Coordinates of C-alpha atoms in Angstrom, one line a residue:
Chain A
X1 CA 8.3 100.9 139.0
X2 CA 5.9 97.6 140.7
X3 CA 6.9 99.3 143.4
X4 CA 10.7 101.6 144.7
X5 CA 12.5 104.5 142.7
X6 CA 11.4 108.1 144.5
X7 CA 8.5 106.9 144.4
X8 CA 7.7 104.5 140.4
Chain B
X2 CA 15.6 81.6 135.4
X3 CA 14.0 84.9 136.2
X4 CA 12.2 84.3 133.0
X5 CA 9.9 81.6 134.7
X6 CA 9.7 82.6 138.1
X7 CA 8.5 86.1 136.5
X8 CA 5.7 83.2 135.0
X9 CA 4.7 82.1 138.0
X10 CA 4.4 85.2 140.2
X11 CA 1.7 86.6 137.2
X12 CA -0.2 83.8 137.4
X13 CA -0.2 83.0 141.5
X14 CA -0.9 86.8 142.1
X15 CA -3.7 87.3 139.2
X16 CA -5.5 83.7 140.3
X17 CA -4.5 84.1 143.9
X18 CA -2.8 80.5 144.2
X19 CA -0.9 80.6 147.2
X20 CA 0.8 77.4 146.3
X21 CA 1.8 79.1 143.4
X22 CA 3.5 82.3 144.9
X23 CA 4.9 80.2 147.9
X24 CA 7.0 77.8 144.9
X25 CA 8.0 81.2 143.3
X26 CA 9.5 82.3 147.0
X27 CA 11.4 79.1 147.4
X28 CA 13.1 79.7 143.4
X29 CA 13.5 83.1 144.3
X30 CA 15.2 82.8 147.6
X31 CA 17.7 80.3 145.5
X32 CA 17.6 82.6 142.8
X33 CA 19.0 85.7 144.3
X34 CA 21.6 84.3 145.9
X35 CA 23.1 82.8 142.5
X36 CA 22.1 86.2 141.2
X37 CA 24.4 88.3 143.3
X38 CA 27.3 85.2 142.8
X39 CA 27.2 85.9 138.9
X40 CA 26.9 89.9 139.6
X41 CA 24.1 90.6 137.1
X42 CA 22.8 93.4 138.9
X43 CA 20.1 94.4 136.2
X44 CA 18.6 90.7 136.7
X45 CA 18.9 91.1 140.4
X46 CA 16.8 94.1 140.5
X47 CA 13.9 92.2 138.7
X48 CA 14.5 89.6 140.9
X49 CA 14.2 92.0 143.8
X50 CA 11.1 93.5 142.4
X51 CA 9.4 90.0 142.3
X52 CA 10.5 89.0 146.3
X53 CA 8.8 92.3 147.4
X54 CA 5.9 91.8 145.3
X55 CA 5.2 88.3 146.2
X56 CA 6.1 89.3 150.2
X57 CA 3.6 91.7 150.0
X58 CA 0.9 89.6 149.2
X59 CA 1.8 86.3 151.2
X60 CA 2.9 88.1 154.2
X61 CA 6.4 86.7 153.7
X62 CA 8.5 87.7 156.5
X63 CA 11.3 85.2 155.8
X64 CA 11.8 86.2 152.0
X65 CA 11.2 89.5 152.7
X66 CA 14.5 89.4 154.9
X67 CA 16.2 87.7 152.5
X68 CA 15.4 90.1 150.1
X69 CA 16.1 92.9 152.3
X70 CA 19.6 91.0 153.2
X71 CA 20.7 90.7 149.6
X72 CA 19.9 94.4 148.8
X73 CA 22.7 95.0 150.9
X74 CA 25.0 93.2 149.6
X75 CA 23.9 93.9 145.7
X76 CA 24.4 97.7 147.2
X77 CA 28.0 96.9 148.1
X78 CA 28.8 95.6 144.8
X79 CA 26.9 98.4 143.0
X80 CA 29.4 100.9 145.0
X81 CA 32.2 98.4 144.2
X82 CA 31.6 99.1 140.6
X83 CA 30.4 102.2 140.3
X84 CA 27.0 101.4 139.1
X85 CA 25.3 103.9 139.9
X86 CA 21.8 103.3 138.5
X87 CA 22.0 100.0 140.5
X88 CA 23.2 101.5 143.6
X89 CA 20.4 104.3 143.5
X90 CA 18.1 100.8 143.1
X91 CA 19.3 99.3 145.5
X92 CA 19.2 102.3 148.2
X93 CA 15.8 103.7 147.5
X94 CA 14.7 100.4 147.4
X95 CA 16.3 99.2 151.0
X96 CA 14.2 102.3 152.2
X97 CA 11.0 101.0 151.2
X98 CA 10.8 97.8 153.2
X99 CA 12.6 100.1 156.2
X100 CA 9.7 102.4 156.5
X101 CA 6.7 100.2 156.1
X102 CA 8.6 97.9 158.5
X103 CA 10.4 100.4 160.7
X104 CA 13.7 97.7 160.4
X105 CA 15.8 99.6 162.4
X106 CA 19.3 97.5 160.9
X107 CA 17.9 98.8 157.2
X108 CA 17.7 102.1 158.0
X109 CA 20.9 102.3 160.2
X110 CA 23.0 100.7 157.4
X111 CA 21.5 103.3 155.0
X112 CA 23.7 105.8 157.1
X113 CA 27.2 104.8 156.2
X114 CA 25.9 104.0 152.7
X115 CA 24.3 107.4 151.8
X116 CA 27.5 109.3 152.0
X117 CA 29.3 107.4 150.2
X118 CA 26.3 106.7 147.8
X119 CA 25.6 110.3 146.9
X120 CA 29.1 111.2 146.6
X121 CA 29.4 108.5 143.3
X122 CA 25.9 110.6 141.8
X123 CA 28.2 114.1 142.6
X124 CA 31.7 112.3 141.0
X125 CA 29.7 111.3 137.3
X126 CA 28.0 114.4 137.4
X127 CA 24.3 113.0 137.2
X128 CA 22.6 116.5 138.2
X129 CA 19.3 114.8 137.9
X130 CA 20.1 111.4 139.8
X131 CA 21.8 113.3 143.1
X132 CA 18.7 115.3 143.3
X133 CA 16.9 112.2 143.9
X134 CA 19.6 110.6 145.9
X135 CA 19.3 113.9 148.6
X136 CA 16.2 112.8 149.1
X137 CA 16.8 109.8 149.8
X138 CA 19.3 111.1 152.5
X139 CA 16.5 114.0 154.0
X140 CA 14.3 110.5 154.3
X141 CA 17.2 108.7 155.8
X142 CA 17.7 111.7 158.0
X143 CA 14.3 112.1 159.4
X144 CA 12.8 109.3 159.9
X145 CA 15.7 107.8 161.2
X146 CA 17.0 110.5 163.4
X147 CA 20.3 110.9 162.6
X148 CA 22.0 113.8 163.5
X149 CA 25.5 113.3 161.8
X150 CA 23.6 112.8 158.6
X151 CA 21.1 115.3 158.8
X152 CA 24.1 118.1 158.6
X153 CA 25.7 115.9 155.8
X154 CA 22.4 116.1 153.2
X155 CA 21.8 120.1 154.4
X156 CA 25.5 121.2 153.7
X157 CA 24.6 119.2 150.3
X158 CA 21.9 120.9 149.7
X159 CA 23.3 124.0 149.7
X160 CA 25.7 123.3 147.1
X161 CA 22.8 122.7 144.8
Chain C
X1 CA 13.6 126.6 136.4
X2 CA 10.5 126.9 138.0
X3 CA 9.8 123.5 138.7
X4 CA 13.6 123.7 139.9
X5 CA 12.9 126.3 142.6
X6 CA 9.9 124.2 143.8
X7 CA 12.3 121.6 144.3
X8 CA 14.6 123.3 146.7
X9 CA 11.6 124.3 148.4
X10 CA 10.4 120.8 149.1
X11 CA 14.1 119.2 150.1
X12 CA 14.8 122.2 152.1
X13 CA 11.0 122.1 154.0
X14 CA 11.3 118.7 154.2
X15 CA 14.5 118.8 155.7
X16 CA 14.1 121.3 159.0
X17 CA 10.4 120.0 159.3
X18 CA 9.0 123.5 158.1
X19 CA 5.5 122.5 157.8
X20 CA 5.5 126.5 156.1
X21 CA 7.5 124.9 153.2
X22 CA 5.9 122.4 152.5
X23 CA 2.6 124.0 152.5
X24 CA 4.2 127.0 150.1
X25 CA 5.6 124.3 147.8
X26 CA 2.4 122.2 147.6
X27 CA 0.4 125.3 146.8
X28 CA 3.2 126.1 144.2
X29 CA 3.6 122.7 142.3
X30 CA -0.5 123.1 142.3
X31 CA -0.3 125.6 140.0
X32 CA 2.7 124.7 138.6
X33 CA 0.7 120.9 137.2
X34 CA -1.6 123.0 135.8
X35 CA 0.8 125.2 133.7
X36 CA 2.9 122.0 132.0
X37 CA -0.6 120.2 131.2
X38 CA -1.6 122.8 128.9
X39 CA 2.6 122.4 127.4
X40 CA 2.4 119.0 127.4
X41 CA 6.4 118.2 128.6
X42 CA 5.6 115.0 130.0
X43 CA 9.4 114.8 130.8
X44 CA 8.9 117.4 133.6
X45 CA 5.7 116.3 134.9
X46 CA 7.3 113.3 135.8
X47 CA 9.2 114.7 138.5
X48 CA 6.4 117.2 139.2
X49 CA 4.1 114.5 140.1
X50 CA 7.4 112.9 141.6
X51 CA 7.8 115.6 143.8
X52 CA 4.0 116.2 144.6
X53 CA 3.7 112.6 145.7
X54 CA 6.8 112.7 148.0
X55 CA 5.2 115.5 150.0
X56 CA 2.1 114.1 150.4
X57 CA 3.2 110.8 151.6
X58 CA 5.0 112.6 154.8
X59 CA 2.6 115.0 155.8
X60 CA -0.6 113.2 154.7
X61 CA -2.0 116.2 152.3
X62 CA -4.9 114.9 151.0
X63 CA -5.9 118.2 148.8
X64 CA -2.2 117.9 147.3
X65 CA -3.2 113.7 146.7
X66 CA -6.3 114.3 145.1
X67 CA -4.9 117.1 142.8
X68 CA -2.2 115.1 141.7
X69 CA -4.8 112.1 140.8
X70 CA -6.4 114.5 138.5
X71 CA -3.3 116.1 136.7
X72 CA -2.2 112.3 136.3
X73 CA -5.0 111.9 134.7
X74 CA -4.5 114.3 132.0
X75 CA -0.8 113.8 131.8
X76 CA -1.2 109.8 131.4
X77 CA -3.7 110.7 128.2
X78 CA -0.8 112.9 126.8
X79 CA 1.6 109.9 126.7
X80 CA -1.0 107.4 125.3
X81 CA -1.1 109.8 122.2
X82 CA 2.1 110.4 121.9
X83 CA 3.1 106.5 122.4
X84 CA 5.8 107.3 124.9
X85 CA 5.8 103.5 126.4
X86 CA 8.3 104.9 128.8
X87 CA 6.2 107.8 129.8
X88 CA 3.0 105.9 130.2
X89 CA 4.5 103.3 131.6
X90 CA 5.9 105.4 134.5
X91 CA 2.9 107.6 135.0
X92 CA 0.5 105.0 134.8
X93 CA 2.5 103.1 137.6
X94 CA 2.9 106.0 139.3
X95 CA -1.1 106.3 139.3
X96 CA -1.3 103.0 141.0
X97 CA 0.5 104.5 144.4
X98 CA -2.0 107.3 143.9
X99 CA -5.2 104.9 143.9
X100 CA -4.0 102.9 146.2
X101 CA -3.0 105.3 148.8
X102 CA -6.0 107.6 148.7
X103 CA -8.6 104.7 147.6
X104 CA -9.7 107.1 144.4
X105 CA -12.4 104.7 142.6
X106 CA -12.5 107.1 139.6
X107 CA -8.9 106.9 139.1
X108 CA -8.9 103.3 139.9
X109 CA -11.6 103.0 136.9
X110 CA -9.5 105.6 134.5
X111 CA -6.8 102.9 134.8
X112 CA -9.2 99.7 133.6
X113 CA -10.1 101.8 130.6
X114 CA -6.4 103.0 129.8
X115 CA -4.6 99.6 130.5
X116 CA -6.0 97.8 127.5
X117 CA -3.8 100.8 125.6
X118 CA -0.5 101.0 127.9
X119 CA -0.3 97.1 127.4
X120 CA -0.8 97.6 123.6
X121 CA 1.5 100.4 123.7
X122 CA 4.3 98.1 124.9
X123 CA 3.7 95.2 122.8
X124 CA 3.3 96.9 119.7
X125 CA 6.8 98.8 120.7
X126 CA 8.0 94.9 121.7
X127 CA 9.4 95.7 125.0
X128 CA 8.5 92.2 127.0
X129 CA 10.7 93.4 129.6
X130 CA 8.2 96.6 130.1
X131 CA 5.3 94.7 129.0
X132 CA 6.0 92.2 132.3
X133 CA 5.8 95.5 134.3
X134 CA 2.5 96.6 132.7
X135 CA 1.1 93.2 132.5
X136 CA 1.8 93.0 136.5
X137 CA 0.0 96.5 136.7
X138 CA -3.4 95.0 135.2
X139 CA -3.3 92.4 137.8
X140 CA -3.1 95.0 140.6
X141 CA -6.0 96.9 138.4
X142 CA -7.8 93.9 138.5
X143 CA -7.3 92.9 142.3
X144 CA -7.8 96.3 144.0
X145 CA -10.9 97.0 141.8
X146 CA -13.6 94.7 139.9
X147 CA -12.6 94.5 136.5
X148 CA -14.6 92.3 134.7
X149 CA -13.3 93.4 131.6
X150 CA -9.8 93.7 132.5
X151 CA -9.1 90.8 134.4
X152 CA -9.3 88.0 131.1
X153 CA -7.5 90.7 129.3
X154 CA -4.5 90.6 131.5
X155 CA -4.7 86.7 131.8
X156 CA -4.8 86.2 127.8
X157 CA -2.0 88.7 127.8
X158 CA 0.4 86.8 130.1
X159 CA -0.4 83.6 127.8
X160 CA 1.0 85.6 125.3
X161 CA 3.9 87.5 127.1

């Protein structure tokens, strides 16, 4: 992701 | 709308107008909090996205809490509802502003919420979302030193 | 299976500290990146390089860093070609944390040649809500690094968006 989930 | 403060965050950060991202931080900061009122917690999380990303360039200290203060309760209603693709958000998210900030509130509310987070990724039987929710909990663990936790995502771990 | 078994060597060495583990595991999912480049499953090279990055961001392997920034090279090219927008979108933001933490200029200049195609990739597929992401990923292309070319692509683009 732009930024969080582990990591994206 | 999201819609437009998502406009105006593109175009502050890619020209560097700090007018611009300083107006998105005051519609965001009103944003959120309606956000969380109408409980659409998809919308929320791109909201969320946009506070830290605009934080993180303006040095914003003041959204940044506000962001880090509505995670918590968008994590609450996520467990409320059993969302658990928010609520895994939500968490891995509140752990990113708690380690490059070392909030020590963040990461001790991360405690109570981690058992109670990982048990909703074990009751739907997500194999693949609990494996990243434990380590979440080894992080939470660790860097945090908590000792009641850090036997909680080991006797998990065994059961894997 | 295998990539299943590295895992439960990362959470468990990452867990009691065992600084063995983690070096075991890193050397593991090494070879392990290498073995699912040449099978091209992009699905589980997604936690590979999931699990690759967690490691080095706590014990600061720079070998294991670099080595990833290579194989996410390769397995960004496999989901251009295969127009996974989901994939590449992922991976290519994924690349970002990469280049940023260990400063790589050739990755940083892999993603100003690639982002012209992920940003294609997710309007030609229509997804405005992941075209926003990749859009904000050529800005942060574009900031960290020079792009000359890049930067009035991803200006035009937002005009558009």
């Amino acid at each position: 992701x732009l930024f969080x989930x582990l990591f994206x | 709308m999201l819609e437009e403060i998502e406009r105006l965050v593109l175009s502050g950060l890619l020209t560097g107008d700090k007018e611009l991202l300083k107006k998105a931080s005051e519609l965001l900061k009103e944003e959120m909090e309606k956000l969380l009122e109408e409980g659409d917690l998809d919308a929320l999380k791109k909201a969320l996205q946009l506070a830290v990303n605009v934080a993180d360039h303006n040095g914003d200290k003041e959204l940044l809490a506000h962001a880090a203060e509505v995670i918590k309760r968008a994590l609450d209603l996520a467990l409320e509802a059993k969302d658990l693709q928010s609520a895994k958000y939500l968490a891995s998210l509140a752990l990113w502003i708690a380690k490059r900030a070392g909030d020590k509130e963040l990461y001790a509310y991360l405690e109570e919420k981690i058992k109670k987070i990982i048990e909703l990724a074990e009751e739907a039987g997500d194999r693949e979302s609990l494996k990243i929710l434990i380590l979440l909990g080894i992080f939470i663990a660790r860097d945090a030193g908590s000792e009641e936790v850090k036997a909680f995502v080991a006797e998990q771990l065994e059961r894997l």
